[PDB]
């Protein structure tokens, strides 16, 4: 595996260390601590974080006597480092919070038994390791962060105690960091952001800029090959924030200490988790994950002055906040836990040294429909209410393959409607990595939402390259992008030949951003089998035919609702019932009906329409109208009557009222059975009910309302070249003006068409007199 060909980021590796060490510093200086003690009244949130900081059992329970040794369990030498760590810190807080005798003593005891016990003695590249890197990189970080804190009421004698414990740790982990995490996944950065803390905690010790300098270069190799530049982490959501555990105090740690602020660089991986958020704030079961909450909130005081995509006036900072807090937390009562790390973490008070009381939680005001075509993740979506049925979100993902935590997704998509997880990702596993069910059924292409063929699933064109798009399109009335992958190309683990040569073009369209159609055309040198697969998440599966509903109940992820499916060609298909696991949190595992639908073919077509529906709404009546060349059908939903349309090749074909030589073309009609909207993919021309609509000289992918007569609005997919459309007006209507990104465009009228060169695609207005 290559990791320098991913394009990710990197920040300066040069280790910057103040004059002199300042105690406290990581979090805070002496002067700030009144002011934190005084955080708890300010709302009901620092109030409920003050309230379990300070019962914390970690404040009363025994200090532990009884060191363990090596040849004891995993999990019982794992849980003595982590509430030696947790005691240190708790109990330090506590002291400057309050100035108990008690808690500085404790912080005191805790920390010159730091490290003790087997831990030196034992290997942690030993799998389930009880001093595994990932552990001891929160341990590293509680114990600086107590120390930093108690060390102005030390003794002489324990300041030097307790610094050669930390300084060992430290030498230790900078000596073994690429050994315990010889590839650059969360494995070398959390322990590397760990060494950070230290080198900044111990800023005087000789060893502090080789430490901070490993450290920063070790964490770079995460960022350059596991993040993209635009946010996304390819270790999936849980991991990123498992990663987030360690990252988040180092990034305040370095500000806070050298005045090196990186929040600026690290921006995009908070922006990432707002543009992926469902309904209810939840990141998607992608890779090797779990459905997760995103703690933008612990970051969010530090974008303030950053201007985000998300809104047209509000600061980042105020949609951070939104986020986090527009959440359902309900999957993590009672406990609260979704770190991962409720061994080790102290969440609680990392949270009330973070949290901005002042910051305004202000939802994003632009169009959900967000394309984020460098890492390949792209999201349909209505609107950014919380938890509101009214809601649809698809994610459409199409991201280059990395070498941990890697599922079997490309160019699947998962949906989110009426309060309830629908389309599935199939999730990380049971419960655990390690187990055999994960590699033989969850990470496999069968327990997604893709085409195979013969078995083989869509992959990258090569290593570390993103998936195409193309024809990207967002209005208020039909959103469409277009992914390519190849099933020749290359995956985990790396295989280098294939008896045949193929691709699938999968196109998304959201029509009235109301439900979806999925149209997938099909190339290969050689007949082979093609099998569609479609999850419903957890639902009962019904229906016969070409046709299924996956009903849905009031379980621990959304509401009662159903999402009904459709597949053509009917004719040219087979429909089997299957059944497969489907797993959104660990050990909350379960069986559901998925639909395999399958052709034996060489270039060939599929779609699908995807509808939610609550509980009782009505069925849509949806008709096949597939014949050899074209694929597709009608959908009559709310007594407006929607038809789609797919071919391979720009040849003049039929299907209902449609007539087009485009690849792919949608129509909607109102009550009335007039036409209201229309998008075409590389069509020269359209006809409804034998009425031309439009030509143009040259290939063009548009979307168009023409519902207002004095204004038909839009948008224009990208343009290699210029084009000249012709839009048909309204009968007996002059144009005023067109308008294409805000700027005037030349155009006249010739036969009772507006007749435009377009040599830049982007938002266009026809506006016409009466
Ligand atoms: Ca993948
Ligand atoms: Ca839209
Ligand atoms: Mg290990
Ligand atoms: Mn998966």
């Given at each position: 595996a290559?990791?320098?060909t991913?394009?990710?980021?990197?920040?300066?590796?040069?280790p910057?260390?103040?004059?002199?060490?300042?105690?406290?510093?990581?979090?805070?200086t002496?002067?700030?601590?009144?002011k934190?003690?005084?955080?708890?009244?300010?709302?009901?949130?620092?109030?409920e974080?003050?309230?379990?900081?300070?019962?914390?059992?970690?404040?009363?329970?025994?200090?532990?006597?009884?060191?363990p040794?090596?040849?004891?369990?995993?999990?019982d030498?794992?849980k003595?480092?982590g509430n030696m760590?947790?005691?240190a810190?708790?109990?330090?807080?506590?002291?400057l919070?309050?100035?108990?005798?008690?808690?500085r003593?404790?912080?005191?005891?805790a920390?010159?038994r730091?490290?003790?016990?087997?831990?030196?003695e034992?290997?942690?590249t030993?799998?389930g390791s009880?001093?595994?890197?990932?552990?001891?990189?929160?341990?590293?970080?509680?114990?600086?962060?107590?120390?930093?804190?108690?060390?102005?009421?030390?003794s002489d004698?324990?300041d030097?105690?307790?610094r050669?414990?930390?300084?060992?740790?430290?030498?230790?982990?900078?000596?073994n960091?690429?050994?315990?995490?010889?590839?650059?996944?969360?494995?070398?950065?959390?322990?590397?952001?760990?060494?950070?803390?230290?080198?900044l905690?111990?800023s005087?010790?000789?060893?502090a800029?080789?430490?901070?300098?490993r450290?920063?270069?070790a964490?770079?190799?995460?960022?350059?090959?596991?993040?993209?530049?635009?946010?996304?982490?390819?270790?999936?959501?849980?991991?990123y924030?498992?990663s987030?555990?360690?990252?988040?105090?180092?990034?305040?740690?370095?500000?806070n200490?050298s005045?090196?602020?990186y929040?600026?660089?690290?921006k995009?991986?908070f922006?990432?988790?707002?543009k992926i958020?469902?309904?209810r704030?939840?990141?998607?079961?992608?890779?090797?994950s779990?459905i997760?909450?995103?703690?933008t909130?612990?970051?969010?005081?530090?974008?303030?002055?950053?201007?985000t995509?998300?809104?047209?006036?509000?600061?980042?900072?105020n949609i951070?906040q939104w986020?986090?807090?527009?959440?359902?937390?309900?999957?993590?009562?009672?406990?609260?836990?979704?770190?991962?790390?409720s061994?080790?973490?102290?969440?609680?008070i990392?949270?009330?040294?973070?949290?901005d009381?002042?910051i305004?939680?202000?939802?994003?005001?632009?169009?959900?429909?967000?394309?984020?075509?460098?890492?390949?993740?792209?999201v349909f979506?209505?609107?950014?209410?919380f938890?509101?049925?009214?809601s649809?979100?698809?994610?459409f993902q199409?991201?280059?393959?990395?070498?941990?935590?890697?599922?079997?997704?490309?160019?699947?998509?998962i949906?989110?409607?009426?309060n309830?997880?629908?389309?599935?990702?199939?999730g990380?596993?049971?419960?655990?990595?390690?187990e055999?069910?994960?590699?033989?059924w969850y990470?496999?292409?069968?327990?997604h939402?893709?085409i195979?063929?013969?078995?083989e699933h869509?992959?990258?064109?090569?290593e570390?390259?993103?998936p195409?798009?193309?024809?990207?399109?967002?209005?208020?009335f039909?959103?469409?992008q277009?992914?390519?992958?190849?099933?020749?190309?290359?995956?985990f683990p790396?295989?280098?030949?294939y008896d045949?040569?193929?691709?699938?073009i999968?196109?998304?369209?959201?029509?009235?951003?109301?439900?979806?159609?999925?149209?997938?055309?099909?190339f290969?040198?050689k007949?082979?089998?093609?099998?569609?697969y479609?999850?419903?998440?957890?639902?009962?599966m019904?229906?016969?035919?070409?046709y299924?509903?996956?009903?849905?109940?009031?379980?621990?992820?959304?509401?009662?609702?159903?999402?009904a499916?459709?597949?053509?060609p009917?004719?040219e298909?087979?429909?089997?019932?299957?059944?497969?696991?489907?797993?959104?949190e660990?050990?909350?595992?379960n069986?559901?009906?998925?639909?395999?639908?399958?052709?034996?073919?060489?270039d060939?077509?599929?779609?699908?329409?995807?509808?939610?529906?609550?509980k009782?709404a009505?069925?849509p009546?949806?008709?096949?109208?597939?014949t050899d060349?074209?694929?597709?059908?009608?959908?009559?939903?709310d007594?407006?009557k929607?038809?789609?349309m797919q071919?391979?090749?720009?040849?003049?074909?039929?299907?209902?009222?449609?007539?087009?030589?485009?690849?792919?073309?949608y129509?909607?009609?109102?009550?009335?059975?007039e036409?209201q909207?229309?998008?075409v993919?590389?069509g020269?021309?359209?006809?409804?009910?034998?009425?031309?609509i439009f030509?143009?000289?040259?290939?063009?992918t548009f979307?168009?309302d023409?519902?207002?007569?004095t204004?038909y609005?839009?948008?224009?997919?990208?343009?290699?070249?210029?084009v000249?459309?012709?839009?048909?007006?309204?009968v007996?209507?002059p144009?005023?003006?067109?308008?294409?990104?805000?700027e005037?465009?030349?155009?006249?009228?010739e036969?009772?068409?507006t007749?435009?060169?377009?040599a830049?695609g982007?938002?266009i207005?026809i506006?016409?007199?009466?």
């Amino acid at each position: 595996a290559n990791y320098e060909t991913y394009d990710g980021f990197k920040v300066s590796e040069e280790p910057v260390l103040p004059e002199k060490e300042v105690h406290p510093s990581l979090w805070f200086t002496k002067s700030d601590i009144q002011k934190i003690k005084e955080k708890k009244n300010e709302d009901s949130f620092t109030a409920e974080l003050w309230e379990e900081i300070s019962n914390s059992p970690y404040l009363t329970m025994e200090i532990p006597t009884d060191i363990p040794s090596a040849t004891d369990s995993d999990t019982d030498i794992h849980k003595y480092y982590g509430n030696m760590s947790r005691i240190a810190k708790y109990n330090a807080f506590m002291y400057l919070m309050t100035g108990k005798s008690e808690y500085r003593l404790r912080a005191t005891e805790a920390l010159k038994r730091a490290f003790d016990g087997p831990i030196y003695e034992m290997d942690p590249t030993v799998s389930g390791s009880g001093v595994d890197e990932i552990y001891r990189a929160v341990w590293a970080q509680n114990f600086a962060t107590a120390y930093d804190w108690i060390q102005p009421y030390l003794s002489d004698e324990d300041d030097e105690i307790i610094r050669e414990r930390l300084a060992k740790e430290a030498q230790v982990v900078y000596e073994n960091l690429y050994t315990w995490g010889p590839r650059p996944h969360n494995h070398l950065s959390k322990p590397a952001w760990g060494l950070g803390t230290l080198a900044l905690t111990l800023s005087d010790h000789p060893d502090a800029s080789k430490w901070l300098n490993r450290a920063l270069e070790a964490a770079n190799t995460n960022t350059l090959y596991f993040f993209n530049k635009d946010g996304h982490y390819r270790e999936g959501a849980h991991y990123y924030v498992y990663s987030l555990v360690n990252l988040i105090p180092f990034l305040y740690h370095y500000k806070n200490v050298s005045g090196v602020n990186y929040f600026p660089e690290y921006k995009n991986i908070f922006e990432w988790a707002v543009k992926i958020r469902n309904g209810r704030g939840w990141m998607p079961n992608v890779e090797d994950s779990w459905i997760k909450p995103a703690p933008t909130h612990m970051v969010a005081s530090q974008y303030k002055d950053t201007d985000t995509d998300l809104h047209s006036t509000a600061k980042l900072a105020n949609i951070l906040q939104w986020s986090y807090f527009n959440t359902d937390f309900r999957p993590w009562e009672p406990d609260g836990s979704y770190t991962g790390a409720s061994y080790d973490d102290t969440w609680d008070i990392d949270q009330y040294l973070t949290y901005d009381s002042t910051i305004e939680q202000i939802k994003p005001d632009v169009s959900g429909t967000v394309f984020m075509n460098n890492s390949g993740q792209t999201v349909f979506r209505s609107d950014w209410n919380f938890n509101n049925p009214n809601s649809r979100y698809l994610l459409f993902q199409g991201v280059a393959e990395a070498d941990n935590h890697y599922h079997y997704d490309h160019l699947s998509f998962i949906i989110h409607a009426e309060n309830q997880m629908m389309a599935s990702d199939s999730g990380y596993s049971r419960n655990s990595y390690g187990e055999g069910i994960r590699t033989s059924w969850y990470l496999t292409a069968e327990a997604h939402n893709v085409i195979t063929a013969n078995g083989e699933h869509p992959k990258d064109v090569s290593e570390n390259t993103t998936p195409v798009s193309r024809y990207d399109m967002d209005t208020d009335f039909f959103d469409f992008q277009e992914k390519e992958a190849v099933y020749d190309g290359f995956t985990f683990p790396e295989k280098n030949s294939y008896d045949f040569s193929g691709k699938q073009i999968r196109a998304i369209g959201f029509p009235r951003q109301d439900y979806f159609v999925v149209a997938d055309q099909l190339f290969s040198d050689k007949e082979v089998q093609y099998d569609l697969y479609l999850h419903g998440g957890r639902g009962e599966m019904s229906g016969e035919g070409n046709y299924r509903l996956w009903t849905y109940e009031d379980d621990r992820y959304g509401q009662e609702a159903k999402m009904a499916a459709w597949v053509f060609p009917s004719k040219e298909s087979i429909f089997i019932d299957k059944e497969g696991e489907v797993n959104y949190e660990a050990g909350a595992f379960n069986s559901y009906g998925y639909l395999n639908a399958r052709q034996i073919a060489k270039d060939t077509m599929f779609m699908q329409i995807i509808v939610p529906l609550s509980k009782y709404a009505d069925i849509p009546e949806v008709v096949d109208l597939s014949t050899d060349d074209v694929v597709g059908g009608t959908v009559v939903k709310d007594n407006e009557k929607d038809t789609f349309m797919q071919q391979l090749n720009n040849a003049e074909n039929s299907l209902g009222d449609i007539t087009t030589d485009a690849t792919f073309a949608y129509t909607n009609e109102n009550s009335n059975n007039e036409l209201q909207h229309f998008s075409v993919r590389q069509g020269t021309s359209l006809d409804y009910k034998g009425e031309n609509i439009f030509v143009s000289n040259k290939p063009i992918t548009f979307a168009l309302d023409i519902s207002d007569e004095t204004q038909y609005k839009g948008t224009i997919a990208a343009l290699n070249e210029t084009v000249e459309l012709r839009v048909k007006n309204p009968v007996g209507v002059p144009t005023e003006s067109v308008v294409v990104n805000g700027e005037n465009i030349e155009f006249s009228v010739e036969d009772g068409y507006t007749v435009i060169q377009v040599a830049e695609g982007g938002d266009i207005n026809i506006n016409f007199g009466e």
